[PDB]
Amino acid sequence: LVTGGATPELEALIAEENALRGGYSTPQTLANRDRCRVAQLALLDGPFADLGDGGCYGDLFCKALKTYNMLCFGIYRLRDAHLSTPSQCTKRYVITNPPYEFELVPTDLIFCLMQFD
Amino acid sequence: VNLLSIFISTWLTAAGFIHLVENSGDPWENFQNNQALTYWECVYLLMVTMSTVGYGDVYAKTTLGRLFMVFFILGGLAMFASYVPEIIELIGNRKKYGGSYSAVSGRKHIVVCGHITLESVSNFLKAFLHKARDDVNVEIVFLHNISPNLELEALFKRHFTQVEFYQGSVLNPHDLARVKIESADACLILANKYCADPDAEDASNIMRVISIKNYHPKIRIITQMLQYHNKAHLLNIPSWNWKEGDDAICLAELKLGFIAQSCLAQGLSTMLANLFSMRSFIKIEEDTWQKYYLEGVSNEMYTEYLSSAFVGLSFPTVCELCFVKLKLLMIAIEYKSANRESRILINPGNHL
Amino acid sequence: RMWWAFLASSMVTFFWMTSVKDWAGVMISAQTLTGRVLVVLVFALSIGALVIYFIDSSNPIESCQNFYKDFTLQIDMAFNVFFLLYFGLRFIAANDKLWFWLEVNSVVDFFTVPPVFVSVYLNRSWLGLRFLRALRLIQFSEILQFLNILKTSNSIKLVNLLSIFISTWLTAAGFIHLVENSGDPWENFQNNQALTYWECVYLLMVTMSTVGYGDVYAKTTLGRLFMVFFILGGLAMFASYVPEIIELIGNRKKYGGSYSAVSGRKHIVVCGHIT
Amino acid sequence: ASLNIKSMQFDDTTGVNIPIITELVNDTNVQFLDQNNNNNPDTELYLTQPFACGTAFAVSVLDSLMSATYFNDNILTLIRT
Structure with missing residues (x-):
């Protein structure tokens, strides 16, 4: 998850020379780019924007997985979103694996795994 | 006389x-x-x-x-x-710590060696001997050639019921026999992260691995390592079988990978650290951020063999069905192929 | 004095099967609550036997305590029944019966229980090495x-x-x-x-x-x-x-205490480079 | 370095057949060069496979040379020659 999909074979090639060598692009190597990456998506101006206004987390997860094959596994939520009074705090906290009935707010970020495009 | x-x-x-x-x-x-x-x-x-x-x-x-x-x-x-x-x-x-460990039947035990001081032992015991951990039947046996100071002696006294110490060198076969390394479930090697020459200390840890594997090749070893390249030296030991549980944990590699993934998506390091860490159960009723955060913290990460009912279905379908019906989130799969060994695939596409 | 008889008795007593050994060992050790309560029971019974020893030692050693004459003799008889059963059951579970034959608890059992059996049998009690129960x-x-x-x-x-x-x-x-x-x-x-x-x-x-x-x-x-x-x-x-x-x-610890705040007296905390 | 050389692979073979001799300070570390499953890890120095094959030079043999020189002078004069 954290090393960018480093394979033991690449480790062996590094060990053979203690360096990273370039290589001409081939279909087999150009097909290695097709792996998911960690990303954060906002709900302001996108296909899921209408989900932000009180929509359930499960609906967003199912829609993302079905349409774009993005795996949403956490919410990055403003620390003062639950407060009724306005606040200037920009800091956010982490809510990993929310349940289906979780309610969203438009000012939320989604932790997701995106396929290569 | x-x-x-x-x-x-x-x-x-x-x-x-x-x-x-x-x-x-x-x-x-x-x-x-x-x-x-x-x-x-x-x-x-x-x-x-x-x-x-x-x-x-x-x-x-x-x-x-x-x-x-x-x-x-x-x-x-x-x-x-x-x-x-x-x-x-x-x-x-x-001799204060010249005894030999007695293997109590029905009680597993692990042997911890390497850099054993106040800081390393304290951190390892906090992570391992956690109160929230329920089924911990293993006994920790430290083996180190330097007699502990007052603070380490007090720390060992505090956890006397599960922690034992012995003065010996892991490179000495007699000392390996003293701590009953044959019956040990695993050997955990701790390095010191704060040293002038990390390469020499990594070489020392690899020496300890070589000694342990020479004495008993079938034991499972988990070793802390400081530099990424030195891990290559662990592939030159034929007894080192990482497919059977032998693991090297590169501190720099994992640390900076967590930091870089946080750079890509901030807060990921906290999520990951909470996933594999054990937390005591705490109740928060007032509407604050702690109440929402603890609900996510309650989760952990597990591995399970997929039921035969799922065979032949694409990954998105299986994951969606697991979430909607079973209330489980499945993130990665272990794909075993004839051409190549088993590989971890995180969120594979619908073409799989 | 009939010390010879009791001393000789104690001295003579001084000098699928694996499945039965393990089954006995399950209920004797501390892994199961049965073994734990058995340990507590033998300890309490040992304390009772020591109290009975004190009571009987208030009396002359060469006594004629018949079975029906004194009840405390009957209670001690029951104590020795329990002790006999206990080490008889511990005997089979011994992986090396020789070493467990030469343990302090076994020695106390040999020098205590057979003398009680002989004393009850002859209806004449001798206050012998019954104080060894204190070792328990x-x-x-x-x-x-x-x-x-x-x-x-x-x-x-x-x-x-x-x-x-x-x-x-x-x-x-x-x-x-x-x-x-x-x-x-x-x-x-x-x-x-x-x-x-x-x-x-x-x-x-x-x-x-x-x-x-x-x-x-x-x-x-x-x-x-x-x-x-x-x-x-x-x-x-x-x-x-x-x-x-x-x-x-x-x-x-020399300086491990905590400061006691005295009312009517201010104080300051000095830290940093203290030499 | 010994194991790194022994684990190499070359295109026409492998590195286990490369002739190497390793200086070792400790006699107990000589057995680490033999990757075969030695049943007894308590064998004497001269009975270990790396020592018998000559692929390891134990520095402790110079103490035995000193003892032999004490017991017989001429032996040293031969060895130096």
Whole structure:
């Protein structure tokens, strides 16, 4: 998850020379780019924007997985979103694996795994 | 034996002197002032005296008897003072941590070696001997060639019921036999993250791995490593079988990978750290951010074999069905192929 | 005196199968609650037997306690029944029966239970080596760990020291009491001293502290020999046992306390480079 | 370095057949060069496979050389030659 999909074979090639060598692009190597990456998506101006206004987390997860094959596994939520009074705090906290009935707010970020495009 | 022999000889000689003097009398008193003491009674008198007990039931009455008793007191005290320090504190020395671990049946145990100090042991015990951990039946056995200081001794005393320590070197086969490395579930090697030469310390850890695998090739070893390249040296040990549980945890690699993934998506490091860490259960009722955050913190990460009902279905379908029906989130799969070994695929596409 | 009969009895008693061994070992050790409650039960029964020993030692050693004459004899008979069953069941589970035949608890059992059986059989009781049951108070320390009462290792060590000291004190007092109530065999039991058990305890305490009053002391030859051997053993055990444990315990932090706020007095905290 | 050389692979073979001699300070570390499953890890220095094959040079043999020189001078004069 954290090393960018480093394979033991690449480790062996590094060990053979203690360096990273370039290589001409081939279909087999150009097909290695097709792996998911960690990303954060906002709900302001996108296909899921209408989900932000009180929509359930499960609906967003199912829609993302079905349409774009993005795996949403956490919410990055403003620390003062639950407060009724306005606040200037920009800091956010982490809510990993929310349940289906979780309610969203438009000012939320989604932790997701995106396929290569 | 010299001590015992000289002590018994002096005891018997003094008893004989007292017997001879007491049974005879004072020559100036015309041999009239005499007392009837058996030799064994004199032995009893001498031992009662030399213990500074002095019952008074048996004692010397003649002038020569009292004089010899006083000189026996003086000589015994002088000999004791001049003799006991050297010999007794030569003998009264015992090795504090030279014992051997006793393998209790039905109780697994692991052996922890490497850099063992206050900080490393404290961190390892906090992560391992956590209160929130329920089923921990393993006993931790530290093996290190440096005797612990006061703080480490106190820390070991605190966890005396599950933590033991032994003074030995993992590179010594005798010390490996002492801690019963054959019956150990696993060997965990800790490195010091703060050293002038990380390469030399990594080489030392690899030396320890080589020694442990030489003694018993089938044990499972988890070793902390400082630099990424040095992990290559762990592939030159034929006994090192990472497909059977042998693991190297590269501190720099994982640390900076967490940091870089946080750069890509901030807060990911906290999520990951909470996933594989154990947390005590805490209730928050007031509407705050802690209440929402703890609900996510309640989760952990597990591995499970997929049911045969899922076979033939694409990954998105299986994951969506698991989430909607089973209330589980499935993130990655272990794909085993004929061409290549098993590989971890995180969120594979619908083409799989 | 019929000390020969009981002494000979105790001396003679002194000198799928693996599945049965394991099954016995399951209910004897601390893994199961059955073994734990069995340990607590044998400890409580040992305490009761020691109390019965004190009560019977208030009486002369060469007594004629018939089975129906004194109830305490019947309760002690039941105690010995339980003890006999207990070590008989522990015997099979022994992986090395030879070593468990030469353990202190087994020795106490051999020197205690068969003498009681013979005393009940002949309806004439001899107050013999029944004080050895006190050696079953060291396990008290372990029991104070079973019920989750002792937590600090130093507290467990202190309880172990106290239990060992009390057991040795009572056992040596019992030896002295038995020897002095009777006489020397070569004097045909003519030089015997009327000495109660508590007087023997007091004498032993005065002796081990090297006070040595002399108001109560050993008179018989066997009594004096046992007193000398007790002095030797006490001095050797002290020298080889107190340094380690005591100088481990007798250590305290010099400046580990907390500040006590005195009302009507301000204070400041100075930190940093303090030399 | 010994194991790194032994684990190499070359295109026409492998590195286990490369002749190497390793200086070792400790006698107990000599057995680490033999990757075969030695049943007894308590064998003497001269009975280990790396020592018998000559692929390891234990520095401790110079103490035995000193002892032999004490017991017989001429031996040293031969060895140096």
